[PDB]
RNA sequence: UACAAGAGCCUUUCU
RNA sequence: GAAAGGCUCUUGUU
């Protein structure tokens, strides 16, 4: 048996605006639209965006902290006949003006602006870049759609040279929209070490009165009928009081293994980074776990919790912070619709962002809820299920649901509220980037096609070093 | 591969 | 049933 059991429901939710809904169980349920957190920005004005219907924009808004870009480069892998230097100059001008309007001043044209062909030319030229322009902060790599050049660029920048690289498709260079450039600039500001925005500090739940770390974990697996290809487990952790900046750890682990075998070491490194950054050990630990089925609830809860506790024991003598273990499930057949036409959203007629249901469709004796935190524009919105497998922090339903909503609003690649909290999304992004690293490790030997070359040519140590990113990359948000 | 979100086709073994 | 992975497609945004 297992010595750990999930805590029951501490109470029912009361905060938010009451909204009748229908669910395919039709079962008439009652949700609560949580009010969106105010998004605090920077600049001279320090604008406070109010997410309207799940969405806010970057018009008249500057970054909370903007990173000036004095040195950057452009490597165009698109065909020169298809992406002319006129197009590149127009893209540079439009991107510079949008970035300056967003509080991210780019001082002048890139020093390097050259054309290259093939993935095999990525690693030399990139190395040449690191050997030519000191203080280089970014390379804009233009790509003609799908190519191995993308994964080779990602591998070289992340796990080889420690270089921040942003890729743009060719079709977004010839025709440029202000929204595309603004989202690009969001990614640039995140990748270079700046914070785009924070939640309004006076509107946060009381859990931020004490030091706290937010952990997001996700394991991706290759298709079945395999065993040469391993699973990839990624755990990210928030590195400051404003839950925006995240550090990442990644591990190659056994084929189709769901529990994170090396979770204790990853959590230990993340806690060490948190103590280095905030100079305070986390009093509370919030763990958002993605990609765990119902039938494997307890095993993960038996292992990973212990691992986290082990990391705490390995952090300092007599250090047992309260641990909150929640599992995120975007995949389920639970659909929610508004009962009256006056509350439907857009053309698609979805439910509003913030719709939280913790009654009548959840587990009667367990702490779980549904939260639709994203604005649906097509079809039927799919809310995210959050089941609290462990709660040493004595959370209430209101505080945990509001914290989940604000974490969903902390996603930084867009000015939108998304379906899952930012740590889970970042764990997914790190897992995908690690899979790109693993794929482009085998780019000179794409398929191998050998007996001994495939029997013991991809041993676990080599892939473990393959997913490990550079030292200059480890502390940054390369995955965004 | 600017981003989010939702329906589809193809490996995929539990069958 | 699920790991979600590719291929796309659709609505788009400031
Ligand atoms: Mg994933």
Coordinates of C-alpha atoms (C1' of nucleotides) and ligand atoms in Angstrom, one line a residue:
Chain A
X1 CA 0.0 0.0 0.0
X2 CA 0.8 3.7 0.1
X3 CA 1.2 5.9 3.2
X4 CA 0.0 9.1 1.4
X5 CA -3.6 10.0 0.7
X6 CA -5.1 13.1 -1.0
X7 CA -6.5 15.7 1.4
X8 CA -10.3 16.2 1.3
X9 CA -12.0 19.4 0.3
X10 CA -11.2 22.1 2.9
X11 CA -14.3 24.2 1.9
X12 CA -16.4 25.2 -1.1
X13 CA -15.7 28.1 -3.4
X14 CA -17.5 31.4 -2.7
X15 CA -15.5 34.1 -4.4
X16 CA -16.2 35.2 -8.0
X17 CA -19.4 36.0 -9.9
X18 CA -22.0 33.3 -10.0
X19 CA -22.8 31.8 -13.4
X20 CA -25.2 29.0 -14.3
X21 CA -23.6 26.4 -16.7
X22 CA -24.5 23.1 -18.4
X23 CA -22.2 20.1 -18.5
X24 CA -22.4 16.8 -20.4
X25 CA -22.8 14.6 -17.3
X26 CA -27.5 17.7 -19.1
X27 CA -26.2 18.5 -15.6
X28 CA -26.9 22.0 -14.5
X29 CA -23.8 23.2 -12.6
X30 CA -22.9 26.5 -11.0
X31 CA -19.5 28.1 -11.7
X32 CA -17.9 31.3 -10.5
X33 CA -16.1 33.7 -12.9
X34 CA -13.1 34.7 -10.9
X35 CA -12.1 38.3 -11.4
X36 CA -9.0 38.6 -13.5
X37 CA -5.8 39.8 -11.7
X38 CA -4.6 43.3 -12.7
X39 CA -1.5 43.0 -14.8
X40 CA 1.2 45.5 -13.7
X41 CA 3.5 47.0 -16.3
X42 CA 6.4 49.4 -16.3
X43 CA 7.6 52.4 -18.3
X44 CA 6.9 56.0 -17.4
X45 CA 3.2 55.5 -16.9
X46 CA 3.3 52.1 -15.2
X47 CA 0.1 51.0 -16.8
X48 CA -2.2 48.5 -15.1
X49 CA -3.9 46.3 -17.7
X50 CA -7.3 44.9 -16.8
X51 CA -7.7 41.6 -18.8
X52 CA -11.0 42.1 -20.5
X53 CA -12.8 38.8 -21.4
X54 CA -9.5 37.0 -20.9
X55 CA -7.5 39.2 -23.3
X56 CA -5.3 42.4 -22.9
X57 CA -3.0 44.1 -25.4
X58 CA 0.4 45.8 -25.4
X59 CA -0.9 49.1 -26.9
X60 CA 0.4 52.1 -24.9
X61 CA 2.1 49.7 -22.5
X62 CA 5.8 49.2 -21.7
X63 CA 7.6 46.2 -20.2
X64 CA 7.8 45.9 -16.4
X65 CA 11.6 45.6 -17.0
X66 CA 12.8 46.1 -20.6
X67 CA 16.1 44.8 -21.9
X68 CA 18.0 47.2 -24.2
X69 CA 19.4 45.4 -27.2
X70 CA 22.7 47.0 -28.2
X71 CA 24.1 43.9 -30.0
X72 CA 22.1 41.5 -32.1
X73 CA 22.5 39.6 -35.4
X74 CA 20.3 38.2 -38.2
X75 CA 21.1 34.9 -39.9
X76 CA 18.7 34.4 -42.8
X77 CA 18.3 30.7 -43.8
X78 CA 15.4 31.6 -46.1
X79 CA 16.2 31.7 -49.9
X80 CA 17.6 35.1 -50.8
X81 CA 15.4 35.3 -53.9
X82 CA 12.4 34.7 -51.6
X83 CA 13.4 36.8 -48.6
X84 CA 15.1 39.9 -50.2
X85 CA 17.4 42.3 -48.3
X86 CA 14.6 44.9 -48.8
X87 CA 12.3 42.6 -46.8
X88 CA 14.9 42.1 -44.1
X89 CA 15.4 45.9 -43.8
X90 CA 11.6 46.5 -43.6
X91 CA 11.4 43.7 -40.9
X92 CA 14.3 45.3 -38.9
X93 CA 12.7 48.7 -39.1
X94 CA 9.2 47.5 -38.1
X95 CA 10.6 45.3 -35.3
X96 CA 12.7 48.1 -33.9
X97 CA 9.7 50.5 -33.8
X98 CA 7.4 48.0 -32.2
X99 CA 10.1 47.1 -29.6
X100 CA 10.7 50.8 -28.8
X101 CA 7.0 51.2 -28.4
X102 CA 7.0 48.2 -26.1
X103 CA 9.8 49.5 -23.9
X104 CA 12.6 47.3 -25.4
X105 CA 14.9 49.8 -27.2
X106 CA 17.0 48.2 -30.0
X107 CA 20.0 50.5 -30.7
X108 CA 20.5 50.3 -34.4
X109 CA 20.8 47.7 -37.2
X110 CA 22.3 44.3 -36.4
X111 CA 26.0 44.1 -36.8
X112 CA 25.8 40.7 -38.5
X113 CA 23.2 40.2 -41.2
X114 CA 24.1 37.3 -43.5
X115 CA 22.6 34.4 -45.4
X116 CA 23.4 30.7 -44.7
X117 CA 22.2 27.4 -46.1
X118 CA 21.7 24.0 -44.5
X119 CA 21.8 22.9 -40.8
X120 CA 25.5 22.0 -41.2
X121 CA 26.3 25.7 -41.5
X122 CA 24.5 26.6 -38.3
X123 CA 27.1 25.5 -35.7
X124 CA 30.2 27.2 -37.4
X125 CA 28.5 30.6 -38.1
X126 CA 26.9 30.7 -34.6
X127 CA 30.3 29.9 -33.1
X128 CA 31.7 32.6 -35.4
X129 CA 29.1 34.9 -33.9
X130 CA 30.2 34.1 -30.4
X131 CA 33.8 34.7 -31.6
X132 CA 33.1 38.0 -33.3
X133 CA 30.7 40.2 -31.4
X134 CA 31.3 40.4 -27.7
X135 CA 28.2 41.0 -25.5
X136 CA 26.0 39.4 -28.2
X137 CA 22.5 39.1 -26.8
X138 CA 20.3 37.7 -29.6
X139 CA 20.4 36.1 -33.0
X140 CA 17.2 36.4 -35.2
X141 CA 17.2 33.3 -37.4
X142 CA 15.0 33.4 -40.4
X143 CA 13.7 30.0 -41.5
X144 CA 11.7 29.0 -44.6
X145 CA 9.2 27.0 -42.7
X146 CA 9.9 23.5 -41.5
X147 CA 13.6 22.5 -41.6
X148 CA 16.2 20.7 -39.6
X149 CA 18.0 24.1 -39.4
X150 CA 15.5 25.0 -36.6
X151 CA 16.4 22.1 -34.3
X152 CA 20.1 22.5 -35.1
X153 CA 19.8 26.2 -34.2
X154 CA 18.0 25.3 -31.0
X155 CA 20.5 22.7 -30.0
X156 CA 23.5 24.9 -30.8
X157 CA 22.1 27.9 -29.0
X158 CA 20.8 26.1 -25.9
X159 CA 23.0 23.1 -25.2
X160 CA 26.2 24.0 -27.0
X161 CA 27.0 27.7 -27.0
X162 CA 24.6 29.3 -24.5
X163 CA 23.2 31.6 -27.1
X164 CA 19.7 33.3 -27.1
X165 CA 18.2 32.7 -30.5
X166 CA 14.8 33.7 -31.8
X167 CA 13.5 32.1 -35.0
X168 CA 11.1 33.8 -37.4
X169 CA 9.3 32.2 -40.3
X170 CA 9.9 33.7 -43.8
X171 CA 6.2 34.4 -44.3
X172 CA 6.3 36.7 -41.2
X173 CA 9.2 38.7 -42.7
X174 CA 7.7 39.6 -46.1
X175 CA 4.4 40.6 -44.6
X176 CA 4.7 42.1 -41.1
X177 CA 1.8 42.8 -38.7
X178 CA 2.1 44.8 -35.5
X179 CA 0.6 41.9 -33.4
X180 CA 3.2 39.5 -34.7
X181 CA 6.0 41.9 -34.0
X182 CA 4.6 42.5 -30.5
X183 CA 4.5 38.8 -29.6
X184 CA 8.0 38.5 -31.0
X185 CA 9.1 41.3 -28.8
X186 CA 7.5 39.6 -25.8
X187 CA 9.5 36.5 -26.5
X188 CA 12.7 38.6 -27.0
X189 CA 12.3 40.4 -23.7
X190 CA 11.7 37.1 -21.9
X191 CA 14.7 35.3 -23.5
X192 CA 17.0 38.2 -22.7
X193 CA 16.3 38.2 -19.0
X194 CA 13.6 40.8 -18.5
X195 CA 10.2 40.6 -16.9
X196 CA 7.4 41.8 -19.2
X197 CA 4.7 42.2 -16.5
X198 CA 3.8 41.1 -13.0
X199 CA 0.5 40.5 -11.2
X200 CA -0.8 43.4 -9.2
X201 CA 0.9 42.8 -5.8
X202 CA -2.0 44.1 -3.7
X203 CA -4.5 41.8 -5.5
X204 CA -2.7 38.5 -4.9
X205 CA -3.8 35.8 -2.4
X206 CA -2.2 35.9 1.1
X207 CA 0.1 33.0 0.1
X208 CA 2.6 35.6 -1.2
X209 CA 3.1 37.1 2.3
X210 CA 5.6 34.2 2.9
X211 CA 8.3 33.0 0.5
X212 CA 6.9 30.5 -1.9
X213 CA 8.1 28.5 -5.0
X214 CA 5.9 27.4 -7.8
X215 CA 7.0 24.1 -9.5
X216 CA 5.7 22.8 -12.8
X217 CA 6.5 19.3 -14.0
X218 CA 5.8 17.4 -17.2
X219 CA 7.0 14.1 -18.7
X220 CA 6.8 13.6 -22.5
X221 CA 7.1 10.2 -24.0
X222 CA 8.0 8.9 -27.6
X223 CA 5.5 6.6 -29.4
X224 CA 5.1 2.9 -28.4
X225 CA 7.1 0.1 -30.0
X226 CA 10.4 1.6 -29.0
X227 CA 12.9 1.7 -26.2
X228 CA 15.9 3.4 -27.9
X229 CA 14.0 6.7 -27.4
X230 CA 13.7 7.8 -23.8
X231 CA 11.2 9.8 -21.9
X232 CA 11.9 13.5 -21.1
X233 CA 11.0 14.9 -17.7
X234 CA 11.1 18.7 -17.2
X235 CA 10.6 20.6 -13.9
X236 CA 10.6 24.4 -13.8
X237 CA 10.5 26.6 -10.7
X238 CA 9.6 30.2 -10.1
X239 CA 12.7 32.3 -9.1
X240 CA 11.1 35.3 -7.4
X241 CA 8.2 36.6 -5.4
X242 CA 6.4 37.8 -8.6
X243 CA 5.7 34.4 -10.2
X244 CA 7.0 35.3 -13.6
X245 CA 10.7 34.3 -14.0
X246 CA 11.3 30.5 -14.1
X247 CA 14.3 28.3 -14.1
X248 CA 14.3 24.9 -15.8
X249 CA 15.8 21.4 -15.2
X250 CA 15.4 18.5 -17.6
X251 CA 16.2 14.8 -17.4
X252 CA 16.4 11.9 -19.9
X253 CA 14.7 9.0 -18.1
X254 CA 13.6 5.4 -18.8
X255 CA 11.3 4.7 -21.8
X256 CA 7.6 5.3 -21.0
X257 CA 8.2 6.0 -17.3
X258 CA 5.6 8.3 -15.8
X259 CA 7.1 9.1 -12.4
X260 CA 10.1 11.5 -12.5
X261 CA 12.8 9.3 -11.2
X262 CA 15.4 12.1 -10.6
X263 CA 12.9 14.5 -9.2
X264 CA 14.8 14.9 -5.9
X265 CA 17.9 16.3 -7.6
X266 CA 15.9 18.6 -9.9
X267 CA 13.9 20.0 -7.0
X268 CA 17.1 20.4 -5.0
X269 CA 18.8 22.4 -7.8
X270 CA 15.6 24.5 -8.3
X271 CA 15.5 25.3 -4.5
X272 CA 19.2 26.1 -4.5
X273 CA 18.5 28.6 -7.4
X274 CA 15.5 30.0 -5.5
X275 CA 17.7 30.5 -2.4
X276 CA 20.4 32.2 -4.5
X277 CA 17.9 34.5 -6.1
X278 CA 15.4 35.6 -3.4
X279 CA 17.8 34.9 -0.5
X280 CA 15.0 33.1 1.3
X281 CA 14.0 29.5 1.4
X282 CA 10.4 28.8 0.3
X283 CA 8.1 28.5 3.2
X284 CA 5.5 26.9 0.9
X285 CA 5.9 24.7 -2.2
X286 CA 3.2 24.6 -4.9
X287 CA 3.7 21.7 -7.3
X288 CA 1.7 21.6 -10.6
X289 CA 2.1 18.2 -12.3
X290 CA 1.1 17.7 -15.9
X291 CA 0.4 14.5 -17.8
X292 CA -0.5 12.2 -15.0
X293 CA -3.5 9.9 -15.5
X294 CA -6.0 9.0 -12.8
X295 CA -4.9 5.4 -12.5
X296 CA -1.4 6.5 -11.6
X297 CA -2.4 9.1 -9.0
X298 CA -0.9 7.5 -5.9
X299 CA 2.4 6.2 -7.3
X300 CA 3.5 9.6 -8.4
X301 CA 2.2 11.0 -5.0
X302 CA 4.2 8.3 -3.2
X303 CA 7.4 9.0 -5.1
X304 CA 7.6 12.7 -6.1
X305 CA 6.3 14.1 -2.7
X306 CA 9.0 12.0 -0.9
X307 CA 11.5 13.2 -3.5
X308 CA 10.5 16.8 -2.8
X309 CA 10.8 16.1 0.9
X310 CA 14.2 14.5 0.3
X311 CA 15.3 17.6 -1.5
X312 CA 14.2 19.7 1.5
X313 CA 16.1 17.4 3.8
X314 CA 19.1 17.8 1.4
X315 CA 18.7 21.6 1.4
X316 CA 19.3 22.3 5.1
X317 CA 19.1 20.3 8.3
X318 CA 15.5 20.5 9.8
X319 CA 13.8 22.1 6.8
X320 CA 10.3 20.8 6.0
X321 CA 8.3 23.5 4.1
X322 CA 4.6 22.8 3.5
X323 CA 4.2 21.1 0.1
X324 CA 1.1 21.6 -2.1
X325 CA 0.9 18.9 -4.8
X326 CA -1.7 19.5 -7.6
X327 CA -2.0 17.7 -10.9
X328 CA -3.1 19.4 -14.1
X329 CA -5.3 17.6 -16.6
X330 CA -6.2 19.5 -19.8
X331 CA -7.4 16.3 -21.5
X332 CA -10.9 15.2 -20.4
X333 CA -14.4 15.1 -21.9
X334 CA -15.9 17.7 -19.4
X335 CA -17.5 20.4 -21.5
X336 CA -19.1 23.5 -20.0
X337 CA -21.6 25.9 -21.7
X338 CA -23.4 29.0 -20.5
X339 CA -27.1 28.6 -19.9
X340 CA -28.2 31.9 -21.3
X341 CA -27.3 33.7 -24.5
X342 CA -26.3 36.9 -22.6
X343 CA -23.2 35.2 -21.2
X344 CA -21.7 33.5 -24.3
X345 CA -18.3 34.7 -25.5
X346 CA -17.7 35.9 -29.1
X347 CA -18.8 34.2 -32.2
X348 CA -18.0 30.8 -30.8
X349 CA -20.3 31.4 -27.8
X350 CA -18.0 29.9 -25.2
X351 CA -17.8 30.4 -21.4
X352 CA -15.9 33.4 -20.0
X353 CA -12.3 33.2 -18.9
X354 CA -12.2 32.5 -15.2
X355 CA -15.0 30.0 -15.0
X356 CA -14.3 27.8 -11.9
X357 CA -16.5 24.8 -11.0
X358 CA -15.8 22.8 -7.8
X359 CA -19.2 21.4 -7.2
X360 CA -21.4 18.6 -8.5
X361 CA -19.0 17.3 -11.2
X362 CA -15.9 17.0 -9.0
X363 CA -14.9 14.4 -6.4
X364 CA -17.1 14.5 -3.3
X365 CA -14.3 13.8 -0.8
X366 CA -11.3 15.2 -2.6
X367 CA -9.8 18.6 -3.4
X368 CA -10.3 19.0 -7.1
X369 CA -11.9 21.6 -9.4
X370 CA -12.2 22.7 -13.0
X371 CA -11.0 26.1 -14.2
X372 CA -11.5 27.5 -17.7
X373 CA -8.9 30.3 -17.6
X374 CA -8.6 30.9 -21.4
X375 CA -10.9 32.8 -23.7
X376 CA -12.3 30.4 -26.4
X377 CA -12.6 31.8 -29.9
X378 CA -13.2 28.5 -31.7
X379 CA -15.5 25.5 -30.9
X380 CA -16.0 24.6 -27.3
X381 CA -13.5 25.6 -24.6
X382 CA -11.9 22.8 -22.7
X383 CA -11.3 23.8 -19.0
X384 CA -8.3 22.4 -17.0
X385 CA -8.8 20.0 -14.2
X386 CA -6.8 20.5 -11.0
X387 CA -6.7 17.7 -8.4
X388 CA -4.9 18.5 -5.2
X389 CA -3.0 15.4 -4.2
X390 CA -1.2 16.9 -1.2
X391 CA -1.8 20.0 0.9
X392 CA 0.4 20.8 3.9
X393 CA -0.3 24.5 3.5
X394 CA -4.0 24.3 4.6
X395 CA -5.3 26.1 1.5
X396 CA -8.9 27.0 1.1
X397 CA -10.7 26.3 -2.2
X398 CA -11.0 30.1 -2.9
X399 CA -7.3 30.8 -2.3
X400 CA -6.1 27.9 -4.5
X401 CA -8.5 28.6 -7.3
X402 CA -7.5 32.3 -7.3
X403 CA -3.8 31.3 -7.2
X404 CA -4.4 29.0 -10.2
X405 CA -6.1 31.8 -12.1
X406 CA -3.4 34.3 -11.4
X407 CA -0.7 31.7 -12.4
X408 CA -2.6 31.2 -15.7
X409 CA -2.5 34.9 -16.2
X410 CA 1.3 34.9 -15.6
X411 CA 2.0 33.2 -18.9
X412 CA 4.5 35.4 -20.6
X413 CA 4.7 34.4 -24.3
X414 CA 1.4 36.2 -24.9
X415 CA -0.8 38.9 -23.3
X416 CA -3.6 36.4 -22.8
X417 CA -4.8 34.1 -20.1
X418 CA -4.1 30.6 -21.1
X419 CA -5.6 27.2 -20.2
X420 CA -3.0 26.1 -17.6
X421 CA -0.7 27.9 -15.1
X422 CA 2.6 29.2 -16.4
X423 CA 4.8 26.5 -14.6
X424 CA 3.0 23.7 -16.3
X425 CA 3.2 25.4 -19.7
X426 CA 6.9 26.1 -19.1
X427 CA 7.5 22.4 -18.2
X428 CA 5.8 21.4 -21.5
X429 CA 8.0 23.9 -23.4
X430 CA 11.2 22.6 -21.8
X431 CA 10.2 19.0 -22.6
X432 CA 9.6 20.0 -26.2
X433 CA 12.9 21.9 -26.5
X434 CA 14.7 18.9 -24.9
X435 CA 13.1 16.7 -27.5
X436 CA 14.4 19.1 -30.2
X437 CA 17.9 18.7 -28.7
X438 CA 17.6 14.9 -28.7
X439 CA 16.4 14.9 -32.3
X440 CA 19.1 17.1 -33.6
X441 CA 21.8 15.2 -31.7
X442 CA 21.2 12.7 -34.5
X443 CA 21.5 15.1 -37.4
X444 CA 24.9 14.1 -38.9
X445 CA 23.8 10.5 -38.3
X446 CA 20.1 11.1 -38.9
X447 CA 18.9 7.5 -38.8
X448 CA 22.1 5.5 -38.0
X449 CA 21.3 2.4 -40.1
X450 CA 23.8 0.1 -38.4
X451 CA 23.8 -2.9 -36.1
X452 CA 26.2 -1.8 -33.4
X453 CA 25.5 1.8 -34.2
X454 CA 21.8 1.3 -33.1
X455 CA 22.4 -1.4 -30.5
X456 CA 24.6 0.8 -28.2
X457 CA 24.9 4.0 -30.1
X458 CA 22.4 6.0 -28.0
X459 CA 23.2 5.0 -24.4
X460 CA 21.5 6.9 -21.6
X461 CA 24.6 8.9 -20.7
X462 CA 25.0 10.5 -24.1
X463 CA 21.3 11.6 -24.2
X464 CA 21.6 12.8 -20.6
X465 CA 24.4 15.1 -21.7
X466 CA 22.4 16.0 -24.9
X467 CA 19.4 17.4 -23.0
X468 CA 21.6 19.3 -20.6
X469 CA 21.6 23.0 -21.6
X470 CA 24.6 25.3 -21.4
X471 CA 25.5 27.2 -18.2
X472 CA 24.6 30.6 -19.7
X473 CA 21.3 29.0 -20.9
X474 CA 20.4 27.2 -17.6
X475 CA 19.5 30.4 -15.7
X476 CA 17.5 32.0 -18.5
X477 CA 14.1 31.4 -20.0
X478 CA 15.4 29.8 -23.2
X479 CA 12.2 27.8 -23.5
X480 CA 10.0 30.8 -24.1
Chain B
rU1 C1' 9.4 28.5 -36.8
rA2 C1' 5.0 35.4 -33.1
rC3 C1' 1.1 33.5 -30.2
rA4 C1' -3.3 31.3 -28.4
rA5 C1' -7.2 28.1 -29.2
rG6 C1' -10.3 24.1 -31.7
rA7 C1' -11.7 20.3 -35.0
rG8 C1' -9.4 16.7 -38.4
rC9 C1' -6.1 13.1 -41.1
rC10 C1' -1.2 9.5 -40.4
rU11 C1' 2.8 6.1 -37.1
rU12 C1' 1.4 4.2 -32.3
rU13 C1' 0.2 -0.7 -29.0
rC14 C1' -4.0 -1.8 -25.1
rU15 C1' -6.6 -4.4 -28.3
Chain C
rG1 C1' -6.8 5.1 -24.2
rA2 C1' -3.0 7.9 -24.2
rA3 C1' 2.0 9.4 -25.1
rA4 C1' 0.0 12.9 -27.2
rG5 C1' 3.8 13.2 -31.4
rG6 C1' 4.1 14.6 -36.5
rC7 C1' 1.2 16.4 -40.8
rU8 C1' -2.0 19.9 -41.6
rC9 C1' -6.8 22.9 -41.3
rU10 C1' -9.8 26.8 -39.0
rU11 C1' -10.6 31.5 -36.2
rG12 C1' -7.3 35.3 -35.4
rU13 C1' -5.0 39.1 -32.7
rU14 C1' -3.3 45.7 -32.2
Ligands
LIG1 MG1 3.8 17.8 -23.2

